Copies of this chain bind each other. A is one copy, B any other.
Amino acid sequence: MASMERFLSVYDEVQAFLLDQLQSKYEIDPNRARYLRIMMDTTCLGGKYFRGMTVVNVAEGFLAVTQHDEATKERILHDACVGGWMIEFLQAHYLVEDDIMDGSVMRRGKPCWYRFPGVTTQCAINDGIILKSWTQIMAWHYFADRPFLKDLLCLFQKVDYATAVGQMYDVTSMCDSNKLDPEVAQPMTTDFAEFTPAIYKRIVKYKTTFYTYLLPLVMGLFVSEAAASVEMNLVERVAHLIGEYFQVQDDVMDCFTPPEQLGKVGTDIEDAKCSWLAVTFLGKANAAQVAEFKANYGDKDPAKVAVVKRLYSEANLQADFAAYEAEVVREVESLIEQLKVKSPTFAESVAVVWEKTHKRKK
């Protein structure tokens, strides 16, 4: 509501500072400033801002149940917005490199940045790297003399690294561990032995949950100086859980949601990704169903994709997702309940985060 407007207003402020500074300190010319402005806008906007708005929400929750002088209310909320944009830009960074890494065509209804007619792949790689650097400029500039600066940055470091590590689990999830070797070329897996719930869970824990859930939540606490007033173990546990469900949704939608609605084009089947559908399929498939899977998965051929998708339809995975959903709903409620004990209001924020995640169709 008033929350979204404030968040969006801050972007313009952040962008102005960044681009103005490129002029006065970095000798940028008008056309390259425009290039980076459009880059920023394309890769940072048009998402649903779940991450960014979570830190705002968490911050709002503590303001509402307490009393603050108007000045201190604005500092915190502005800080929450800047923090949120740090996260949004960090995802921008990830999505840029990820689309290149996954050979994707579309993101958020437009071409992937690296596929923009005037954008070279080589430049896109560096653009992505600029996006992450931007998070650091904005933290030092806006949070210069904040008590939480050191904790915020340290946490940002840890989360970004966990995500880089997860991306390598993800991007190497179709290879055989025992044949993984920089010196020797290696084909994708034939046995699919490493398509297990445990291995799947580990990829997702790192590539997704830390920066999508833990960071927005804990960052919200940081700007409020309210970390102490929650059971951090619970925050961690609820972030990993909602985070995992989030990625399961993403994996399902990759296959089943029309691009016209999703805003992106699926590549999981073609890239031989250890997705939730593939693992769950191998969890229930008979001998003939497995054999057909192995002969068709991980190949660009549009016909072979249809054989996998057909197999996915026949195995009632759509319904296995419901049984997973139901299970997750129980666990989330359980953790929300446990969060109410020390912080009834943060638990409400987590409830909101959950409902948004639960109800999304992207």
Contacts and interface: CB of A to CB of B under 8 A. Distances in A.
Interface of A: 22, 26-29, 31-32, 34-36, 38-39, 42, 97, 100-103, 116-120, 122-123, 125-127, 129-130, 133-134, 136-137, 140, 150, 153-154, 157-158, 160-162, 164-165, 167-169, 171-172, 177-178, 180-186, 202, 205-206
B119 A164 contact: no
Number of copies: 2
Contact of A168 (B130, B140, B150): B130
A31 B118 contact: no
B167 A126 contact: yes
A26 B182 CA distance: 21
A95 to B, nearest CB: 13
A123 B172 contact: yes
A169 to B, nearest CB: 8
Contacts of A157: 133, 136-137, 140
Contacts of A101: 122-123, 125-126
B183 A116 contact: yes
Nearest to A93: B129
A184 B136 CA distance: 30
A39 to B, nearest CB: 7
A125 B26 CA distance: 26
Contacts of A130: 161, 164-165, 168
The 6 closest A-B pairs by CB, nearest first: A101-B122, A133-B161, A117-B185, A136-B157, A118-B182, A31-B180
Contacts of A186: 117-120
A158 B133 CA distance: 8
A125 B140 contact: no
A35 B180 contact: yes
A186 B121 CA distance: 12
